[PDB]
């Protein structure tokens, strides 16, 4: 499905983007949708 | 060119947001004046 594989943020990836944000490193993934960027 | 740049307004507000909070953004400018 292209609709539910559009983003790569899984629940395990979302824990990882939040971890690098708190430890002040840059993860390779970055939010794209507007409410995802909020 | 115009289609090569990924910078819309909705990307440009996001690049200046990640630059200010120092997290770093995935996109980066490629033109000379974009890097200024």
Swiss-Prot record, chain B:
Lipid-anchored residues (S-palmitoyl cysteine): 25
Expression triggers: Down-regulated in the pyramidal cell layer of CA1 in the hippocampus by global ischemia.
Annotated consequence of substituting residue 22 to R: In RNA edited version
Intramembrane parts of the chain: 7-22, 23-25
Posttranslational mods: Palmitoylated. Depalmitoylated upon L-glutamate stimulation. Cys-25 palmitoylation leads to Golgi retention and decreased cell surface expression.
Distribution of this protein across tissues and organs: Detected in forebrain. Detected in dendrites of neuronal cells. Expressed in the pyramidal cell layers of CA1 and CA3 and in the granule cell layer of the dentate gyrus.
Subcellular location: Cell membrane; Postsynaptic cell membrane; Postsynaptic density membrane
Cytoplasmic domain ranges by topology: 26-31
Task performed by this protein: Ionotropic glutamate receptor that functions as a ligand-gated cation channel, gated by L-glutamate and glutamatergic agonists such as alpha-amino-3-hydroxy-5-methyl-4-isoxazolepropionic acid (AMPA), quisqualic acid, and kainic acid. L-glutamate acts as an excitatory neurotransmitter at many synapses in the central nervous system and plays an important role in fast excitatory synaptic transmission.
Family to which this protein belongs: Belongs to the glutamate-gated ion channel (TC 1.A.10.1) family. GRIA2 subfamily.
Domain notes per entry: The M4 transmembrane segment mediates tetramerization and is required for cell surface expression.
Additional remark text: The postsynaptic actions of L-glutamate are mediated by a variety of receptors that are named according to their selective agonists. This receptor binds AMPA (quisqualate) > L-glutamate > kainate.
Subunit organization: Homotetramer or heterotetramer of pore-forming glutamate receptor subunits. Tetramers may be formed by the dimerization of dimers. May interact with MPP4. Forms a ternary complex with GRIP1 and CSPG4. Interacts with ATAD1 in an ATP-dependent manner. ATAD1-catalyzed ATP hydrolysis disrupts binding to ATAD1 and to GRIP1 and leads to AMPAR complex disassembly. Interacts with GRIP2. Interacts with GRIP1. Interacts with NSF via its C-terminus. Interacts with CACNG2, PICK1 and GRIP2. Interacts with GRIA1 and SYNDIG1. Part of a complex containing GRIA2, NSF and NAPA and/or NAPB.
Protein's UniProt name: Glutamate receptor 2
Source organism of the structure: Rattus norvegicus
Phylogenetic lineage: Eukaryota, Metazoa, Chordata, Craniata, Vertebrata
Shown residues in whole-protein numbering: 586 to 621 of 883
């Amino acid at each position: 499905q292209s609709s539910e594989s559009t983003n790569e943020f899984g629940i395990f990836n979302s824990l990882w983007f939040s971890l690098g944000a708190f430890m002040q490193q840059g993860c390779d993934i970055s939010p794209r949708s507007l409410s995802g960027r909020i």
